[PDB]
Amino acid sequence: QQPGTSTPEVHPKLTTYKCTKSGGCVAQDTSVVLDWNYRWMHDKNFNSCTVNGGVNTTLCPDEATCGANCFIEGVDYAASGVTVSGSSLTMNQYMPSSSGGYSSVSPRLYLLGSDGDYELLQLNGQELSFDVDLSTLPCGENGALYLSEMAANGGANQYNTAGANYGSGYCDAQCPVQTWKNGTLNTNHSGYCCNEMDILEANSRANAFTPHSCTATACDASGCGFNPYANGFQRYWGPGFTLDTSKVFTIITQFNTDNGLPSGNLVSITRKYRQNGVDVPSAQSGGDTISSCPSASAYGGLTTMGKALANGMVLVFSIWNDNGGNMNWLDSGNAGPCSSTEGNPSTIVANNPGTHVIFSNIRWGDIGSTTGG
Ligand SMILES: *[C@@H]1O[C@H](CO)[C@@H](O[C@@H]2O[C@H](CO)[C@@H](O[C@@H]3O[C@H](CO)[C@@H](O)[C@H](O)[C@@H]3O)[C@H](O)[C@H]2NC(C)=O)[C@H](O)[C@H]1NC(C)=O
Ligand SMILES: *[C@@H]1O[C@H](CO)[C@@H](O)[C@H](O)[C@H]1NC(C)=O
Predict the structure, then answer these.
(1) d(CA 244, CA 280)
(2) CA–CA separation, 145 vs 238, rounded Å?
(3) Would the CA dihedral through 261, 262, 265, 266 be positive or negative?
(4) How many whole angstroms from its chain centre is CA 329?
(5) Catalytic site residue from 9, 63, 141, 201
(6) Residue environment code for 292-330, b if the CB has 16+ CB neighbours within 10 A, otherwise e
């Protein structure tokens, strides 16, 4: 909980822009930081403080004790699957193993600001657009760009001076019990819930954008997702399809409010695509929009999402697969064209190692002001 001196932590800078209707786009000095749990933490004598996703009780009985004795280290970002250049960020599901195979480095990054706190994105009544390359992501792979209402300082406190510069304080709508819940040891082994907007969870075969609203207590773990295949338009998204996933494309997510201003109440989430210089038509007539969100209705639904988006959330980038489900909920069944088995990590690392997602040209701001005439 003090920054280690062995591996200096240098955050790779990723060029992002905030855009106004009248003032145009202004560049931000944003970087990316890899998640807390991916890091090695040790003693002053190089005895580790972590052991198997759980602290080493000999060294962290206390949180005061653990603040004093422990030092969390920097990261080889290229080794971790992360490579960055200009506005572009490439994330690799796998990296070569010295022992001959492929290690499954599964990066989770956050958008960090100049001050060393997370760059909070206020998106109620606002839009966020980026370009993506998911051509090399097959079934069962999750290239993900989302937001979470995590603390901007990552939860840093008197006993944790590392904080967001080391990816501290992750939370999501699945309320995960982290070994450090918001910057401090989870002695209680509690779960950390917070509102989570998923802009993209996708591969070249299927995709979904999901809002998950939360009370302070709990979350709508499975939100009111929007998958075009699952809504009937099965040959809309895919290689060669209306939106060609084999080439780069542009994703615009628009958070529409009743009064038109960030001050208002969130009433819809509209998704628009552009590729090959042209607006790609919506799957459903009159727009790919989320108005109704029944699942969230026990959590003040879709309105509380707008309040968290208005407060400002943390930008998260990720790529992963699950050994349990094969991501079948995303790309299989009536949600996509993949087999129940096809999505299994075994088949992936065999057939598509170095499957990777490329996020680029992230911009956010006034609606209509982030895309280009
Ligand atoms: C929790 O952390 C404890 C304490 O940092 C770790 O235990 C330590 O492990 C190292 C290496 O296994 C021991 O090193 C040896 O120390 C003795 C005397 O220092 C020396 O004669 C040896 O040549 C070697 O340097 C160290 O003593 C030991 N310390 C204690 C207090 O047990 C440990 O890795 C963690 N616990 C678990 C269960 O993993
Ligand atoms: C996370 O930690 C920060 C600072 O220690 C605290 O301000 C913030 O409230 C904590 N988390 C939550 C749930 O607020």
Answers:
(1) 10
(2) 19
(3) positive
(4) 18
(5) 201
(6) ebebbeebebbbbbbebbbebbbbbbbbbbeeeebbbbb
Taking domain 1-373, whether its CATH number is 2.70.100.10 is answered by yes
In 3D space, the residue among 170, 178, 222 whose CA is nearest the CA of residue 198 turns out to be 222
> How far apart, in whole angstroms, are the C-alpha atoms of residue 115 and residue 363?
20
Q: Is 213 helix (H, G, I), strand (E, B) or coil?
A: coil
Q: Which of 182, 185, 193, 195 to mutate to test the pocket of ligand 2 (most atoms within 8 A of CB)?
A: 182
Structural domain boundaries in the chain? 1-373
Ligand 2 centroid to 149 CA: how many Å?
Answer: 11
Ligand 2 center from residue 244 Cα (angstroms): 42
User: Nearest ligand, CA of residue 49?
Assistant: 1
- For residues 206 and 336, the answer to whether their CB atoms sit within 8 Å is yes
- Indicate which technique resolved this structure: X-ray
